[PDB]
Paper text:
More recently, a class of “single-component” FDHs has been identified. The flipping allows the carbon-to-be-halogenated to be oriented toward the catalytic residue K258 and within the hydrogen bond distance to the putative general base E200, such that the halogenation site on two substrates is switched from C5 to C7.
We also inspected the structure of [name] in complex with 5-Br-Trp and found that V220 is in close vicinity to the Br on C5 (**[Fig fig1]**). Unlike [name]-[name], no di-brominated Trp was detectable in all doublets with [name]-[name]/[name], hereinafter termed [name]-AI, being the most effective variant, whose 5-Br-Trp production is 3.2-fold higher than the wild type enzyme (**[Fig fig1]**). Compared with the wild type enzyme, [name]-AI exhibits much lower activity against 5-Br-Trp but approximately 25 % substrate conversion occurred in 8 hrs, suggesting that the variant still possesses C7 halogenase activity. The crystal structure of [name]-AI in complex with Trp was solved to reveal the substrate-binding mode to facilitate the subsequent rationale design (**[Table tbl1] and [Fig fig2]**). The substrate was found to bind to the same location as those in the WT and [name]-[name], suggesting that the substitution of V220 with Ile marginally, if any, influences the substrate-binding pose (**Fig. S2**). As the case of [name]-[name], we failed to obtain the complex structure of [name]-AI and 5-Br-Trp. Therefore, we assessed the putative binding pose of 5-Br-Trp by modeling 5-Br-Trp from the [name]/5-Br-Trp complex structure to the crystal structure of [name]-AI/Trp (**[Fig fig2]**). Based on these analyses, we considered that additional steric hindrance in the vicinity of Br on the 5-Br-Trp may assist to reduce the binding of 5-Br-Trp so as the production of 5,7-di-Br-Trp of [name]-AI.
Numbering used by the authors: 1 to 579, 586 to 612, 631 to 653
Write the structure that this text describes.
């Protein structure tokens, strides 16, 4: 009897396949001849974009230990080539066929295929990915459509890539949405670049939910009255957050587009701009788009005619070339039959950690949990370890399955509370999920085992990426010590992130909000850092048209759109003319780096109380997680 069948092989499955080879577990892969969306995009030369996620969170530990030099954003091309390098290693273990039905019995599944060949496997893993409506727009993108108007009913990472590709062909963008959360993917800390996943310090949740809330939520909830923040200048961007019924912030189910702010874009790319664009580094600055009027927010229920294909905003009858219905993603699950009879219904919440479903035996899901920030790599690596342990270690299998139903109830209560299932429940802050999986496995770190201040910074401020949990113990990867070392030396041991928590431990919700925005350049959606870059923008648009071999006439003005922008930017034209963290962080960082190697338990009683609080980090009081204990 075949021990393991993996169905679907692209990216999600790589770390699990590796672990099965290490323990010489009998496995077969079954994967479609047609391949993935990256194959569609490759064949037709449309791999001319970059990832919305850092190298550090988007590539697996066993590649990072070889190829990590510096923080950066990898190209679509690089991400694809790394898929195709790992496919080549494992191609011999891959059967090219499509699975159409799984019949699940007590201790085995019967797998049917399109060819007619059937397979018996004790353990079955789905890593088949998602069907995506928006894929057609990207794969079959026409770059001649010019001076046309587009309406989008949802803002996600796909719409933003499309918007980034349209704007330089002088196409006009209207967002008919009920708000969206956008966040600068890159951020300055005292004039040094940090990708946003570097600054989440997730284990501070263990001190208290309240303190973690103040650490993260002011850029997302409209908590500052600072006129400089996008959600004050352009209030239509704000969302309805009355669904959130969890104390865990940021909440499961919240999505975010990550984008280049133009200042960060400039710093990296201004010096070889045409070459960088051609590699796939595209300016996708949605807040620069609203500021310049090249995108406009309009209310959710604005008048449109679907037959006449027209928008009417204030009083101009705008003919719209295309309406784009937003990205809805649904798992590519084949029919699964319970006791080889009853069709199985997929619901993220009715599975444990997005991986173990109920009423099925020895079936696991790999690649169906979405990270809020950073790459999928973080989630699928830790899931691969969870799945590998369940398949190979019956003790572990028994421990998890014994009370599966209760664990799932306890997880749902902590992360979703009494909220009705939503289509985005599958989205999780990465540094909670990876940490959650690591405690179920037992490759987690113990806060009480911190000896020095250096140790506290690794436990609390060092990002909760999958490789952090592969330094030592059951899933150790050779070279992780040298990686953690390199990362720490480049980021000042994440002291700047640790000092933020120091500074706001005595503040309330409103106070932290005002403090978050007291900076020269606050982290996200700082509209003071846009006007200065109008000249560069026009250099960029010209550079894009030179790469994409396109020529529109800029000397022809669409006076009607100029008119629709004014109506839109009404609050901005009121709020903008009404236009400390830097000092606190600066003083804080120098304090921490002076006592790096000082013993915690040693540190004296009666700076000031910043000591009492650093000693309690040995005994955090929100450490309980009922789905694990
Ligand atoms: C436009 C776009 C941009 C993205 N950008 C990023 C990014 O910047 N950072 C990031 O971290 N993530 C990103 N992602 C997400 C993620 O990297 C991709 O979705 C990734 O391809 C998912 O990996 P997977 O292995 O789960 O799925 P896939 O790559 O789709 O692999 C699944 C494979 O299984 C096959 N298959 C499906 N059903 C069956 C079946 N029944 N039988 C047999 N074979 C089957 C498919 O043909 C496919 O080859 C992006 C996704 C998209 C669409
Ligand atoms: N803690 C950092 C970074 C940060 C805040 N909220 C975030 C949300 C997502 C990612 C990063 C962050 C800050 O307050 O500035």
């Amino acid at each position: 009897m075949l021990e393991v069948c993996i169905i679907g092989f692209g990216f999600s499955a790589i770390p699990l396949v590796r672990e099965l080879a290490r323990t010489q577990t009998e496995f077969q892969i079954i994967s479609a001849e047609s391949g993935s969306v990256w194959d569609r995009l490759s064949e037709s030369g449309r791999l001319d974009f970059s990832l919305v996620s850092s190298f550090q969170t988007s590539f697996y530990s066993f590649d990072l230990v070889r190829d990590y030099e510096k923080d950066y954003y990898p190209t679509a091309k690089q991400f694809y080539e790394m898929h195709e390098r790992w496919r080549s290693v494992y191609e011999e273990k891959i059967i090219r066929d499509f699975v159409t039905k799984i019949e699940n019995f007590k201790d085995y599944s019967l797998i049917s295929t399109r060819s007619g060949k059937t397979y018996e496997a004790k353990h079955v893993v789905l890593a088949t990915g998602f069907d995506r409506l928006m894929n057609t727009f990207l794969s079959n993108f026409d770059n001649h459509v010019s001076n046309k108007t587009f309406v989008f009913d949802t803002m996600g990472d796909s719409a933003n890539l499309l918007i980034a590709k349209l704007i330089p062909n002088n196409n006009k963008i209207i967002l008919r949405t009920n708000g969206f959360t956008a966040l600068d993917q890159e951020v300055q800390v005292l004039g040094k670049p940090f990708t946003l996943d570097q600054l989440e310090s997730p284990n501070f949740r263990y001190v208290s939910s309240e303190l973690y809330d103040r650490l993260m939520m002011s850029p997302i909830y409209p908590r500052t009255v600072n006129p400089a923040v996008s959600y004050n200048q352009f209030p239509l961007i704000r969302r309805d957050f009355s669904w959130v019924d969890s104390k865990s912030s940021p909440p499961n189910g919240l999505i975010a587009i990550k984008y280049w702010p133009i200042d960060q874009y400039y710093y990296h790319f201004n010096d070889d701009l045409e070459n960088y664009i051609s590699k796939g580094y595209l300016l996708n600055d949605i807040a620069m788009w609203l500021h310049t009027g090249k995108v406009i927010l309009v209310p959710s229920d604005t008048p449109i005619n679907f037959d006449k294909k027209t928008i009417t905003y204030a009083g101009i009858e705008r003919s719209f070339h295309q309406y784009v219905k937003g990205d809805a993603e649904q798992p590519r699950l084949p029919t699964i039959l319970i006791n080889g009879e009853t069709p199985f219904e997929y619901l993220y919440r009715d599975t444990f950690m997005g991986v173990i479903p109920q009423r099925l035996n020895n079936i696991y899901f790999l690649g169906y949990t979405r990270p809020f920030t950073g790459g999928l790599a973080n989630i699928t690596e830790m899931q691969s370890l969870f799945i590998h342990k369940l398949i190979t270690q019956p003790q572990f299998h028994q421990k998890i399955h014994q009370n599966l139903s209760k664990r799932i109830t306890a997880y749902n209560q902590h992360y979703y509370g009494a909220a009705k299932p939503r289509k985005h429940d599958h989205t999780v802050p990465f540094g909670f999920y990876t940490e959650d999986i690591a405690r179920l496995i037992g490759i987690h770190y113990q806060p009480n085992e911190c000896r020095s201040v250096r140790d506290l910074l690794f436990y609390y401020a060092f990002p909760n990426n999958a490789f952090k949990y592969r330094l030592k113990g059951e899933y150790a990867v050779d070279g992780v010590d040298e990686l953690i070392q390199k990362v720490n030396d480049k980021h000042d041991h994440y002291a700047q992130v640790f000092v933020q928590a120091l500074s706001i431990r005595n503040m309330n919700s409103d106070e932290a909000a005002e403090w978050d925005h007291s900076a020269r350049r606050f982290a996200f959606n700082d509209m003071r850092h846009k006007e200065g870059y109008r000249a560069f923008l026009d250099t960029y648009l010209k550079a894009y048209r030179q790469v994409e071999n396109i020529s529109v006439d800029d000397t022809v003005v669409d006076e009607e759109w100029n008119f629709m922008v004014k109506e839109a930017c009404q609050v901005r034209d009121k709020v903008a003319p009404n236009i400390s963290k830097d000092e606190d962080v600066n003083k804080g960082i120098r304090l921490i780096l002076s006592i790096l190697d000082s013993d915690i338990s040693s540190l004296p009683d009666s700076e000031a109380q910043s000591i009492e609080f650093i000693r309690r980090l040995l005994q955090p009081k929100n450490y309980e997680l009922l789905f694990i204990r």
